[model samples]
Structures are given as structure tokens and as C-alpha cells.
Target chain A: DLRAELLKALLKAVEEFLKAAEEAIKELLELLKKALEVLKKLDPKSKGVEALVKGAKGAAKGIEAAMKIAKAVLEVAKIKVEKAIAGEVDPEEALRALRAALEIAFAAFELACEVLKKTLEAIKAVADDKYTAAILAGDNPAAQQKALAETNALCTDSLIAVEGVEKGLKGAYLALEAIIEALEVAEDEEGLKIVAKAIKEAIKKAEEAIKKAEEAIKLAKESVEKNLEKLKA
Target chain B: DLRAELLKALLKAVEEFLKAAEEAIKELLELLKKALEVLKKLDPKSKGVEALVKGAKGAAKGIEAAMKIAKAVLEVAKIKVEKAIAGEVDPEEALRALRAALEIAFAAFELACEVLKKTLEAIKAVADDKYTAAILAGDNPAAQQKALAETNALCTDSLIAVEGVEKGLKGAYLALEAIIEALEVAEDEEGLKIVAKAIKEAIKKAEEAIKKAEEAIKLAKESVEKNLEKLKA
Candidate 1:
């Protein structure tokens, strides 16, 4: 009964986390669209802006597709959960259902990194346009400095969206780990091996995505700095 | 240069594997549809059959959504690859791109397990109908045995489709690992750390999915056996 209670708890927690993750991805997509709008306003005819628009559209489309998939997977997982529980399901299948939740959580992490990268690129474009304008208008350091702060603020909003996804996934991940521990308490060794391995894998993927976020920010900053130097000279 | 060459190799290999995985999922979707058709033929009026039909439809829809996500991710990966190569992309970013490929591959593995579970349920329904008809029509074991073999054949086809996904994902996973090792050889310690961690994670998810597949088959077989006993009594 304790195991059953824990399993039910996990199901609710996983569902909540997936919903949160989905919402974060949806918010990220909206932000990307807003970024595109901002880009069009900044430079309607610039080819760089055109490319940025295209990339933003592509990312949005990808996020939309991923969201659909996530929903589908969660549906499948729920159906299976019902079947297993209504039948007094095996602890093993419960763990497997948990695996589905974990996989979706990882998908959310991937989306987070996707948004993270986009934010950096979008901010770069903002700076690229603003810095160029300031340089051409007589190298006004104040204008350039203001553009820096403005773009920084822009990146901050999108970064918060990325953080939303990261936090949701982390919540789901911890819940999944808790479920695994509960399984351990229930003395289900085989199921423990199954889900524990999945958690181990998720940990690795989560770390890698975080690292990518770091690198994306680094690259974006360097690109912006190089562009500033080029414009200044 | 060696790292670049290896990276190039990984890109091609990952692309090929993802395509293969997509095809497998598509085939699995087709198989599920075919199973539904078979179900309709077996017992169009049975509520059990109706539920199975619905489940099959749900699985197919899920697979379709997943395939779209896979294609979208692969497209994103390709675009990033071009940007990186054209701009002489940092080795660290290259590893991040590899992580995207790995994620898609894991998605494929999840699809495989999804199909595996569907095939089991479908086969169970098949046996359910066949054995019930056999018993009601005067306990003809010959006809019953034939149904068994026929359902076995039916399950085999879908199982092959599942195996196709497993193979495709395994190929992608191994290719990803190769890329990680190549990064190590290039003495890009940080990049290696990033990709290696992802591979380690992928390994866990892959194992969990396989375990699920095993459990699915076991559950299906046991259900079939219990039904046989129920009918016999």
C-alpha cells in the first residue's frame, strides 16, 4: 500500500512537472515570436535580420513539434498507468511508466537549452544592430552603452523562460528520483535497477544541456564583443 | 583536423541513424494501423476490441508526433552544424550538437518501447478473440492452436519493426559515443566531458527502455495464459 501510494504520488508529480515544462516551452515559443517582431522593427531589410527571423521561426516550429510529442507520450504513459493500476499493476511496470516521465523531463531540458541558445542569438542580433547604428551615428559611447543594457534586459526575459523549463524539468527529475527511492524502500530490486539507471542517464543529459547553455552564452558574448570592435574601428 | 573529420563522420552517422529511426517509427505506426484493421475484422462489436482500437490509434498518433519532432530536431542539428563548420565552430559547441543528436536517438528508443508495448496488447486482443471463438464454437483446440500461431506471426511483424527502431537508435548511440571518444583523442578535455556525460545518460535511458520492452512482453504473455485458463475452465 505504501508503494502504491508512492506510485500515485509520482504519477501526479510527473504530470505536474510535464505540464509545467510544456508551459515553459510554450512561453519560450511566444518569446521567440516576440523576438522576431523586435528584429523586424530594428532592421526590416538587413539580411542578418532576415536570417535571424528564419532561425527564430525554425526554433518555434521545432518547439511546437516537440510539445505535441511530449503531450502524446504523456498520454500514452497515463493510459498505461491506468491499465496497470486498475489491474493492481506490477511495481515493475510502474517504474517503466516512471521512465516515460523521466524521458519527457529530459526532453524538457533539451527544450530549455534550445531556448537558451536562441536567447543568446537574439540578444546578439539586438546588439549587432544597436552597436552598428551607434557607431555610424558618430561613435557615441553612451548610445552604445545603453544598447548594451537594453539588449541585456531583452536576454534576461528569454533567459527567465529558459529557467522556467530548467526548473520544471528539475522538479520532475527530483520527483522521479523520489519515486525510485520509494521503490527501493518497497524492496523492488529489479525495478530499482531499471529506474535508477534511467535517472543516472538523465543526470548526464541534464549536465550536458547546462554545459551547452554556458557555451552558448560564452559564444554569444564573444560574438557581440568582436562586432563592437569591428564597428568601433 | 582529426577531430573535424570525426565530427563530420558523426554528423553523417547521426543523420543516417535518425532517418532510419524515423522510418522505423513510421513503419511501427503503419503496423499499429494494420493491427487495428485486424481487430476490426476480429470483433467490431466487442468493447474490448473498441478499447484496443482506440489505444492503437493513440499509439499511432503519438508515433507520428514523435517522428515530426525527430525530423525537426535533426533539421536544427543540421543548421547548427553548418553554422559551426562555416564559422569554424568551437569544439565544445560541436559536442553540444552531438548532444542534440543523442537526444533524438533517445526519443527513438522511447518510440521503440512504445511500439513494443502496443504489439503486446494487440497480440493479447488477438488471442482473446481467437480463443473465445474457439471455446464457444465447441472447444476446437486445432483452430485455437492455429489462432495462437497466427497471432504469434502477427506479433512477430510488429516486433521486427520495434527491432528496427532499436537497431537504428543503437547505431546512433554508438556513433555518438565514437564522437565523444574522438573528442577525447583530440585532447579537448572539456568537450569530452560534456559529450561523455550525455552518452552515459543515454546508456541509462536506453537500458530502461529495453527493460520496459521485456516487461511488456512478459505481461502480455501472462495475460494470454490467464485468459486461456479462464476460457478452459
Candidate 2:
């Protein structure tokens, strides 16, 4: 009965971690989908245009890597968690495995932010050249203006996407951090106190991520303004 | 006896014309092959790359038109020439039909040359980030330098190919031109005078073609040097 109660609590924590982590991954995926969409619409047939869209500006390599990592973690964690609940694995072992997975998720979050940086920059850069020419050639008298408006809207979505990621990252990181602390010397009279102290680090880092989202929102808004004028010409 | 001997001489002239015109078409085929090679290598999946390669520039619509034109001319001329030599076609009519074929070949040549110009420019343009990074990441140490050298060398070949085209173009044009002029009064023209006048135009135009080759070769050399420097760093 004691172990069963413990497994139940651990499962709840695992579920909470997954809820937040999954939300972030999905947001990032949405962001990339939008990015790729704009790049394609810019020039549906050019390979160099593709290279320009994906690689030129910043550390997009890390973004690609991070996306892959996030996908694997979500898939593997779900399978492992299910196995533990069915008694295919021990409860503590499941906790350890999930905690290890969270560590990778933390690393992936850094790269995911780097991708956001580049993607935002790309949203601005695409206002030039063939995209502009293609717009000019468009039969729609308002195609140019329409694209500029859409781009601003997309940038706003990116800001919202980053905000969601921040919320989820903060939730998942703090949960894992507290769990690690609560487990260390967990049998001690002061085990819970250790968790209180250990969690401060996760809290502080998560706060920074929240701040980052706000700043990105500001920059994304600023870019929209600059480009609205640029594209107007 | 006189008509048979005249037919025999006419056949020799037709054979010479066919050889030169075929060589020019084949040289253009070589040029387009190189063009397609670079565009494919630039980004096989990119439609934009294909656009830069064959269609967007100058008279690229003409390339498709030209490619079809050249193929039809070669096929029809060979069939018609065989028919004439077999005594199925009168000699004067045979001359007029061949002259018409060369006119299409001339238009095809103009478009083919335009394709070569843009293709070489694209080759140098492709030396940018992805290609450069790809080279740097390559298992081969010399991939960067090797690509640059080969691209420069390809420009030289494009020039030589253009030169051959001019040589052939002049020969074909002048032969047709003189024949058109000589046939103005069929009664006074001996079969041998038709040969002399036709031969005169070909000889004269070939000299002009030789002169034009020198100019094309210089410009091509300049492009190669400029791109070589542009691609290097």
C-alpha cells in the first residue's frame, strides 16, 4: 500500500511535467511550420531561396537539433511512463528515467530559443528581393500590402508561441528540479527542506525565461513596425 | 549527264552544310547540359533554382522553344536531304527547304547563348553559404577550391562552345543567303555558278563569324576571371 501510494504521487508529477513539456514542443513545432510556410510562399521553386530561408542568419542548426530532441523525449517518456504504471518497471526507476529525460529537454529548450531568434529575424529579412518582386508581379493590387499585414500577424503569433513555451518550460524545469531535491537524502528529517532550497535555482532560471519571452515580444513588435514601413515602399 | 553531275555536286555542298549545322546544335546541347548540371547541383529540389537556371532570364521561354526548334530542324533536314539525294526532291526546292531550316537554327542559337550567360552567373552565385559550409563540412579537404577551379574551367568551355556555334552559324547563314541571291534568275545561273555564289557567301560569313568569335571569347574570359575572384573568398 505504501509503495502504491508513492507510485501514484510520482505518476501525478510525471503527468504534470509532460503536460507542460508537450505544450512547449507543440508551440515550437507550430512556429517552425509557420516559418517554413512563409519561406515556401516566398519562392516555391528555388533551392537557393530555401537555403536563404533556413540557414543564412543565425544558429538554426541548433534549432533543427533541438526539435529532434524534443520529439524523441516526448515519445520515449510517454512509453516509459506507461510501462511503469503497468508494473513493467519499478516506480523509482521510472522516476529516475523521466528525470534524465527532463535534463535533455532543458538543453533542447536553449536551442529552441535560438531558433526563435533566427525565425523572427527571417520574418523581417523576407521582405526583400524575389518576394518583393513576386509581390509586384501579383495580380492582386493589395498582395504587397496583404503580405506585410500577414507577416505582422505571424510575428505576433511567434510572440504568443514563445510565451507558451516560457510557461511550459518554467513549469517542467521547476517540477524536475524540486523532485531531484526532494529525492536527495529523501529519507532525512530535513529532506523536504532541501527541496525548498534546491528549487530556488529552477525558479530563478524559469523567471529568466519568462523575461526572455517578454523581450522577444518587444523586438518582434518593433520589427513589425520597421517592416510595415519598409514593405510599404 | 549534266543534270546527274550537277546533282552530285549539290549533294556534296548539302553534306558540308549539314555537318557544320549539326556541330553547332550539338555544341548548344553541350551548353544546356552544363547549365542543367549547375542548376541541379545548386538545389535539386528547389523550383527557384530551376527558374534561375532555365526560365526566368532573358529569352528562357525561347530555350524551351529553341530546344524544340533545334530538334525538329535537325530531324526534318536529314529526312528532306535524303529525299532530295534520292531524286524525290528537285534540287532548287531542296535548297530552299534547307535554308528555311537554318533560319530556325539561328533563332535557337540566340536563345541557347542566353542560357549559357545566366547559367555561368548562377554557378558563381551558388558558391555562397550552404555550398561553402557544405564544402567545409565535406569529408574532402579540397572541395571548396576544387569547385571554384572547375566552375572557372567550365566558363572557358562555354566560351569555346559559343565560338564553335558562331563558326557554324556563319557558314550556314551565308550559304543560305548566297543561294537565295544566286537563284534570282534561274535561267542565267549555271549549276556551277550556284555553287560559286553559295560558296562565296559561306566563305564571307565564316570570316565574319571568326571575327565575332574573338569578341565572345574575350567577354567570356572576362566573366571567368571575375567569377573566379568572386567565388574565391
> Each candidate's root-mean-square deviation in Å?
29.3, 29.2
Give the top-scoring candidate (lDDT): 1
Predicted complexes: DockQ each:
0.01, 0.00
lDDT of 1 by residue, A85-203 (tens): 67654565556545644564455446435544554554454455456445445688677777666666655554554554455355546646655555656466465556655555554
User: In model 1, what is the error at residue B7, expressed in angstroms?
Assistant: 29
lDDT of 2 at B71: 38
Candidate 2, A1-233: lDDT as tens digits? 33334434544544444444444444454455555566566557878657755653334455446546655665666666677667787555655666666666566565655565465555556654544676678756355555544454444334333433343344335434433423432322232333333333333333343333333333333333343344333
**Candidate 1, B63-107: lDDT as tens digits:** 667667766766777776676667666656766666665675567
Clashing pairs in model 2, backbone N/Cα/C closer than 3 A: A45-B46, A45-B47, A45-B48, A46-B47, A46-B48, A46-B49
Return the interface RMSD of the candidates, in order shown, one decimal each: 23.0, 29.0
Q: Quote the TM-score that chain A achieves in each candidate.
A: 0.63, 0.50
For residues B1-233, what per-residue lDDT tens digits would candidate 2 score against the true structure? 33434334444454444454444444444545545565456545433343333222213222233333333333444444565567675555545444544454454454455445545544544443233444445546387667656665755655565655565456546655565444434524475465564555554564455445445544544544444443332
Deviation (Å) of B194 in candidate 2: 8.9
Worst lDDT 10-window in candidate 1 chain B = B224-233
Task: Report clashes for each candidate as comma-separated counts.
Answer: 1, 6
User: Per-residue lDDT for A43 in model 1?
Assistant: 43
